[PDB]
A paper describes a structure:
The human AAA+ ATPase p97, also known as valosin-containing protein, a potential target for cancer therapeutics, plays a vital role in the clearing of misfolded proteins. p97 dysfunction is also known to play a crucial role in several neurodegenerative disorders, such as MultiSystem Proteinopathy 1 (MSP-1) and Familial Amyotrophic Lateral Sclerosis (ALS). pmcp97 is a member of the classic clade of AAA+ ATPases and is an essential cellular enzyme. p97 is composed of six protomers forming a homo-hexamer with an N-terminal domain (NTD) and two tandem ATPase domains D1 and D2 (1). p97 is an essential protein in regulating cellular homeostasis from membrane fusion, Endoplasmic Reticulum-Associated Degradation, Mitochondrial-Associated Degradation (MAD), Chromatin-Associated Degradation to NF-κB activation (2).
R191 is located at the start of the linker connecting the N and D1 domains, surrounded by negatively charged residues, in particular E195. R191 may stabilize the “down” position of the N-domain by maintaining an extended loop conformation in the linker. A unique aspect of the mutation-induced structural changes in the ADP-bound state of p97R191Q is a dramatic ordering of the linker connecting the N and D1 domains into an α-helical structure between residues 190–199. This structural ordering is observed in p97WT only when ATPγS is bound to the D1 domain, which arises from changes propagated at the other side of the linker proximal to the D1 nucleotide-binding site. The dramatic shift from extended linker to an α-helix upon loss of charge by mutation from arginine to glutamine appears to confirm the vital role R191 plays in stabilizing the “down” position in the N-domain of p97WT.
Numbering used by the authors:
A (entry chain B), B (entry chain C): 12 to 707, 728 to 775
The structure:
């Protein structure tokens, strides 16, 4: 149902794909099962497609040289007639045609060097033997007995139909050899295949340019204003340029890149003309798309504003932004590293009204990126990218590419360094045999410095309700406040009641106040932003409470999202607590939190969860009806609950069936959730210690649990429970109102 | 009486307006009831008007093709012969005339492309069949069997009278094709129809330019100086440019737009001439109006003042501001985003003395804006804009336009995306059938980020005296201090007494101290500015008490207005309270509040209301006679009052008649106003929970009230009442003076 519409696979028209061992283009293997199961007939020029309708046509029935069944092709498939994996191939033979005239020839480098003379008898005639070299009208074929570097691309479409080529014609050398950027631009045309971790961003960007470009006559009949400015965000290395180029090449529009420092490096007044001519050039080449690589490098008019040359550039950019009154179908796009480093004049309407934030990829997103830079080379059988994505959390789209490059380089000076043959022409049987293993990646991760550690991680937690031992009572509570308003908004407006905006978790430390916040976000399939105690203390020690604004601004744009404040009372303990200073309980950070919470629109799906260990020092100003109406108390696990905590924490450890967990939970009375986790950690440590000592077995037995028992820790005593008990009844006060029965 | 003078409706000369299904201009339907009830006679050219005297004249009696009764017209009415809804149409036939010569022809694009030859036999002669194409002297007619894009506008008025045109004449191609701005400028001519939420601003702006422009000889005989500079305010997106253009086009004066960055993007010294020539150009084109789009971008001489080029521009603007000694009837207008970002030299007299503040539209104002951008497209029957205006409070005039654009786009990729027919000529039977529903708006609101959240909301509260349960004693008190001085100023000056400047509300929290402040503003039909506790704490933590000045400056300009300070003692609790620090009760924020309150003119209708929960920590310096003379105590509701609180909070919830509210209020003794509201909220939550559980009924029954009773909360105990009781008698002290009788 969900993925039923995406069914395009399990088609009989498929073929096997392997590595290459042969470098001869004139000798092509023959496949037996394909000629029997399928309907592929005989023919010189076959009309096949699959990737931008660009494949290679070769003559077959030249087998019985190397091997049977398995087919062998050249190693040019890495770049030619193939962009990446996952692309389908459609082959449909078109036999019984007549013989055409010929196709032209495009010299590359082999014609300039060397005497021409006649160009036929030199190396063209003595190369035809039962092979007419079928050439299409834009295909790329590579055949040469040696240096092997030749391309082919035509631009003049003389013949309309398809026929069979023939040798012994008249050719010339009046072609235009294409350079490498014309080949790379084809590879940049990416819809989703070579973009990882940016599914949502593409779904929002492509919809803004699909309609106004491919259907210009759509908005001309309906009173809708298409967007003019699209601003992209993300830390440097995310891939803001790659996405912009891929969308432009996919839509097929005139793309004019405007680099940041390229304009700013010009003379006095010349940069005033480079910007001016760029837009008028795109006007005549309509439809067109315009992208600015570095926008903060052109107009950083926030605090800097120095000099009479750069302000003039900013004013020119502003004038050329609101002055595009329709005219042509051109969309201006730009990229920057930080929302703060932008001219506020560009944030208005008509210049850059649509903002697209491209965040750091999550564990699932980073997995897809690894498959993009590792498709041109093969890997060992014991190489999995699933653990690599999990082990790299602070990496961006370029950090993974650098990691792959370093992993590939490690294998070079570990297997090839022993050859000790300094030759300018190294044998090709070594590079192809180079296989990158897990050991290369282990060193590469250890030597790679991530560039996305300070950024707030905004992902979807992988923890679910099964990882929370027991505590079944509050699971229904959380599902009844954040899921109901998002599934049935009509019911809340029917009664006139407004849904709650937040819930506060109070109780003894180490009981699950964070697992509850993460599991509900996992179930709701929403983002999760965690604010730690040290994060709050940093903004209080530095006298910078204005940083709370970005916390809420990042959250409301990334809707739906939940916002979690761990140990919200961390500042109250720092300034005292039960005694405290000469003031009450009201600081700058919580004041700003309240100010931003009051101003939040209740319609948007942004839920706030607060956690605390000392409810006695919580400011009562946060519990007024409207900010945190619901208070949930998490008690210590009972006999019923501690059993599930062990069954959840031991899923990753091979614990034998001999161990009795029910008896284990019985004696552990004054133990919280965190108390039971360290017991398992110390027990698992003993197994590792015993294994290492016995090296000079794979399962943990019962004795390790008994030995780790001597170091039991009870972080929650009976004294601190008493205040929670007396505080719960203080907030409850339901005496006398228990028996409230209406007379009639 | 109030709206009796505005009666222009219920005229028999009306017609039905519907959608379009036909695209043929030569075939026009015929209306039977209009030819019977009205006096519309037969004629080729009919003298009709209704919107700038611009309509279309067509020949009728070509019906009996599609349908009867209902008439069908072309889809050009969206832009031609119509600007917006609410405009009246007057049709008066003028029959029995003679045949005129002809009207000229204006080519647009169909004459340049293609051979002309004779231009008559090609496509002009074989298109006349019982239709002479009646053409007026400035009408716009569109008829073409195909691409359908042609305009018509004459500028040469050769014939004075009106006659009947005839074909078979001599024409030429020496006309000037008009471009799109000449068509858009007509649509910009808006009095009130296409401006929403700016009734008061237009009433103040149009009166400043109506007299000096339309009646130049008025101020020449009376010793009155007309204004020269009008400054407009508002956050970006409010519509400062649209209002300025609409007034200029309505008054019919030479309008010369001067953009901000347009001047600042010029070379060294060129911008000195662009400004200079603009005023002398307007001098000869008198009367004229001059508008500056970005004034802060030209003269931000407040702190920046860097460079010898921009200061010269500021000095030139200043010189060309006070140097307009009458000369011609030109008025210079400008717009900016913030009062702080302006050169104080422009605030003097003779340059910009009149300041017009254009605020964010209220709920009523935003409703009118939605009807402006949704008039060119039809909506579904279940589409109401009343709830959209209420649900969007932080939106500006452009945020609503963007919201409408996004709502229109959502319907495109939800109903049309299933066609899967990528054709350059999409069928016209799909776009017209596209109906935007509530579901599109629900997603559009959730995905739209408002740009007016940080701005202080200054509106008129919708709450009235009926929403305040009981508390009849103080309702008369508030009506006797803020309404008497504004209705009978003579009575106060007769006795020499000066009216009070403010009233302080003290009592237990959650009793109605805010509803009382809002209801009196609602009854007085005045603005309401609310200052929350966190707002006061922000200016105390940041050591920035100078922000209190804008609070009073925004208030006195927006007269009449009331100013409300919620929990005025919020800073006293933050620095201690009953014990406090080593000082008394005097901080920077309250000191600045007193300084600004003393300096306020008592003549202007600006009333200040203070609210507090801890009167024991209130600075006595604010209760001196002259700042807050009157102190009103709000006690807990008694048996008489709690009944009305329930009857007011349950008006939005379908509560059955089974529930006994009188018995409900009887047992609830120590419950305040806020205590009873959460009971209703939790009870309404149970109905939603039960409905959702029973999905896998519409009325709330009595059992939910009984079940929610177990979670009763008494935020106000008996201990805190005692201090209020002992404080009221402390401030009263009326012992011995109860029996004061004059002897004789
Ligand atoms: N989402 C991604 N998918 C694939 N490659 C990526 C991605 N993000 C970054 N990269 C890699 O990073 C390199 C540089 O990215 P770049 O376009 O420079 O981003 P930016 O310019 O915003 O820093 C690209 O060549 C690409 O290989
Ligand atoms: N019900 C539970 N299920 C699983 N782990 C728990 C549970 N309660 C506590 N823990 C352990 O406590 C650790 C931290 O949990 P957390 O809720 O953050 O404690 P606290 O709420 O005191 O911060 C987790 O790593 C988890 O193993
Ligand atoms: N009061 C209003 N009525 C109608 N449209 C408005 C209003 N305010 C803003 N807009 C919309 O905003 C757009 C123009 O914004 P504008 O007023 O130019 O911004 P600024 O005021 O900063 O120049 C118009 O398309 C208009 O529809
Ligand atoms: N007399 C009353 N009528 C209606 N609602 C009341 C009344 N008293 C208190 N409330 C409820 O209390 C809430 C806030 O009242 P408010 O006056 O702000 O309390 P406080 O004065 O303590 O701030 C409102 O939601 C309102 O419904």
């Amino acid at each position: 149902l969900s993925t039923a519409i995406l069914k395009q696979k399990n088609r009989p028209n498929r073929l096997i794909v392997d590595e290459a061992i042969n470098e001869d283009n004139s000798v092509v293997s023959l496949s037996q099962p394909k000629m029997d199961e399928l309907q592929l007939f005989r023919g010189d020029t076959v009309l096949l497609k699959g990737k931008k309708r660009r494949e290679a046509v070769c003559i077959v029935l030249s087998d019985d040289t190397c091997s049977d069944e398995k087919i062998r092709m050249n190693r040019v498939v890495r770049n030619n007639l193939r962009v990446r994996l996952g692309d389908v191939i459609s082959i449909q033979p078109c036999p019984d045609v007549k013989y055409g005239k010929r196709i032209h020839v495009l010299p590359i480098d082999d014609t300039v060097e060397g005497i021409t003379g006649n160009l036929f008898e030199v190396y063209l005639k003595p190369y035809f033997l039962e092979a007419y070299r079928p050439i299409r009208k834009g295909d790329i074929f590579l055949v040469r007995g040696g240096m092997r570097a030749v391309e082919f691309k035509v631009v003049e479409t003389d013949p309309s139909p398809y026929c069979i080529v023939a040798p012994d014609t008249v050719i010339h050398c009046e072609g235009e050899p294409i350079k490498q950027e014309d080949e790379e631009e084809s590879l940049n045309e990416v819809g989703y295949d070579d973009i990882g971790g940016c599914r949502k961003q593409l779904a929002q960007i492509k919809e803004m340019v699909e309609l106004p470009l491919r259907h210009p006559a759509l908005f001309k009949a309906i009173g809708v204003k298409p967007p003019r400015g699209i601003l992209l965000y993300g830390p440097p290395g995310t891939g803001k340029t790659l996405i912009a180029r891929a969308v432009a090449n996919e839509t097929g529009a005139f793309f004019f890149l405007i680099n940041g420092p390229e304009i700013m490096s010009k003379l006095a007044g010349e940069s005033e003309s480079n910007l001016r001519k760029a837009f008028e050039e795109a006007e005549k080449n309509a439809p067109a798309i315009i992208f600015i690589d570095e926008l903060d490098a052109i107009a950083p008019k926030r605090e800097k504003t120095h000099g009479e040359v750069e302000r003039r550039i900013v004013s020119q950019l502003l004038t050329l932004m609101d002055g595009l009154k329709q005219r042509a179908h051109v969309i201006v796009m730009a990229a920057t590293n930080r929302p703060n480093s932008i001219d506020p004049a560009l944030r208005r309407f008509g210049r850059f009204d649509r903002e697209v934030d491209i965040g750091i990829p999550d564990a699932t997103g980073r997995l897809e990126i690894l498959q993009i830079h590792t498709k041109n080379m093969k890997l060992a059988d014991d190489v999995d990218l699933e653990q690599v994505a999990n082990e790299t959390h602070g990496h961006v789209g370029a950090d993974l590419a650098a990691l792959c490059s370093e992993a590939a380089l490690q294998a070079i000076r570990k297997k090839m360094d022993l050859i000790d043959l300094e030759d300018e022409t190294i044998d090709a049987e070594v590079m192809n045999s180079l296989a990158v293993t897990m050991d290369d990646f282990r060193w590469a991760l250890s030597q790679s410095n991530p560039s996305a550690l300070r950024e707030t991680v905004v992902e979807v937690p992988q923890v679910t309700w099964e990882d929370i031992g027991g505590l079944e009572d509050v699971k229904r509570e959380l599902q009844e406040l954040v899921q109901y308003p998002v599934e049935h908004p009509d019911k809340f407006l029917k009664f006139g009641m407004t849904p709650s905006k937040g819930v506060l978790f109070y109780g003894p430390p180490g009981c699950g106040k964070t697992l509850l916040a993460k599991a509900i976000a996992n179930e709701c399939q929403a983002n999760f932003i965690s604010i730690k105690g040290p994060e709050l203390l940093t903004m209080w020690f530095g006298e910078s409470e204005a940083n709370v604004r970005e916390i809420f601004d990042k959250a409301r744009q990334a809707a739906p999202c939940v916002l979690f404040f761990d140990e919200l009372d961390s500042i109250a303990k720092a300034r005292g607590g039960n005694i405290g200073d000469g003031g009450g309980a009201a600081d700058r950070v919580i004041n700003q939190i309240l100010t931003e919470m009051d101003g939040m629109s209740t319609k948007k799906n942004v839920f706030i969860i607060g956690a605390t260990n000392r409810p006695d020092i919580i400011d009562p100003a946060i519990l007024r009806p409207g900010r945190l109406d619901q208070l949930i108390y998490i008690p210590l696990p009972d006999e019923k609950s501690r059993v599930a905590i062990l069954k959840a924490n031991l899923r990753k450890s091979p614990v034998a069936k001999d161990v009795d967990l029910e008896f284990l939970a019985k004696m552990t009375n004054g133990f919280s959730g965190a108390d039971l986790t360290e017991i398992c950690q110390r027990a698992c440590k003993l197994a590792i210690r015993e294994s290492i000592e016995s090296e000079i077995v794979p399962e943990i037995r019962r004795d390790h649990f008994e030995e780790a028992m001597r170091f039991a820790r009870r972080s929650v005593s009976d004294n601190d429970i008493r205040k929670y008990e007396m505080f719960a009844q203080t907030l409850q006060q339901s005496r006398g109102f228990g028996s409230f029965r209406f007379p009639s």
